[model samples]
Target: ISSSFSFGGFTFKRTSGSSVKKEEEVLTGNLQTLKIRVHEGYEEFTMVGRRATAILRKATRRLIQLIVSGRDEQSIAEAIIVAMVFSQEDCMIKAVRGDLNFGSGLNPMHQLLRHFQKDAKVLFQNWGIEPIDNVMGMIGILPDMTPSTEMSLRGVRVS
Candidate 1:
């Protein structure tokens, strides 16, 4: 079964039976245009930059995926914001991950994404775009007042 509808004069299509694989992600505009506030001012990344472009390269396609998924604004802002987070963590986010060989890089960012995705929910938070528990944990802030129970704040009650 397949269905298509238009919202805000824009048509969205959902084809449940289409034999098409998911489209490849392509970056739009200048990724560097997404910048963060710095102590002196604002700046984007470069090849000679910190984190060595792995995070940016990795997350760029995700930006496209988010946009394509109809998330619109939240994804864009997240790209802007996450890059900043990496900027803040820039100097050493890769230290534990190591640096060499065209970014021996697979292990670096993936493991990092694993953390917030699990305990916090950074990248996965845009599922619907109303905002929940991600933004605070994103800008290097803990989700709850008590550091002992970050996993308890969401409160589904574990047996």
Candidate 2:
């Protein structure tokens, strides 16, 4: 048995497969492409950028400069420059995710940032209002008001 639907010049063929799993997977994949519209891509990208910006702002609010840079083993060198720049601005930093952490020692990325922090260290430093621990957990408290698939055009019922 087989069925099909035609919409906006696209044809969606359902059923007619070796297994139920294959049939469902094919239909699901087709629906995904059909569901995506021209504007959704732009909105998705902006949404991703907004998330990054929000995290950065949160860290900055706590005065805990942070950077998440990694594309593999090249992460250490990347953080080197980032940490240097933050230190130049006289800001304290706590980097996240990069390099392996050894016992009783900071990772290479953290050590790099610390090197700069130590150099620009003040004789009597006021570490600041909040710690990295508080900043990291801020995401959990954020409301899940993200736009859902319902924002898309009304559902289409294949009759």
Candidate 3:
């Protein structure tokens, strides 16, 4: 299900989960910034994510080389790739699937986010903002920056 709402004065739209699409479909189009969360230990990240199984071979490694640094944490259950996109309406992307963990590590995805922030420091030099950090808090915030919708779903239950 997809829905849009506003919180902290930022708008968020729940997108259709990545489950419906293949890695090939998800990895296409104009993505300004692309991220990959991988754990080399996990089959999902290694075998399926690598191994020349198909387009999935391009699933994670290539993007990680471009986005994440070697020293950063790449594997965690909570990990997901977040990207800055070029679209008429949507500017951000948070993955619901297609996660690529290149190795096993005991750290949060935020650790990788921090590393990414540092590596991409030059880009932000012009914008006066760290794209990774700026968007981290606004994971739910999106393009429209509009007011929250008003409704009275405040108290209704089924038992």
**In each prediction, how many residue pairs overlap at the backbone (N, C-alpha, C within less than 3 A)?**
1, 0, 9
Which portions of model 2 miss their true places by more than 4 Å?
1-63, 86-159
Q: Rank the candidates by TM-score, best first.
A: 1, 3, 2
lDDT of each: 0.26, 0.23, 0.21
Regions of model 3 farther than 4 Å from truth: 1-12, 18-81, 84-107, 121-159
Ranking by lDDT: 1, 2, 3
- Clashes (candidate 2): 0
Taking the tens digit of each residue's C-alpha lDDT, what string does model 3 give over 15-111? 3222221122223123323343332210111111111110011222221211111111222100112221111001112221223233312332343
Winning candidate number (TM-score): 1
Tens-digit per-residue lDDT, 21-133, candidate 2: 11111111112211111111100000012112111111111212333223332232233233232222222222222222343134333443444334323211222222112
As a whole number from 0 to 100, the lDDT of residue 89 in candidate 1 is 38
lDDT of 3: 0.21
Q: Which stretches of candidate 1 lie over 4 Å from their true place?
A: 1-43, 46-71, 90-105, 117-159
Give the TM-scores of the predictions, in the order they appear.
Answer: 0.21, 0.18, 0.19
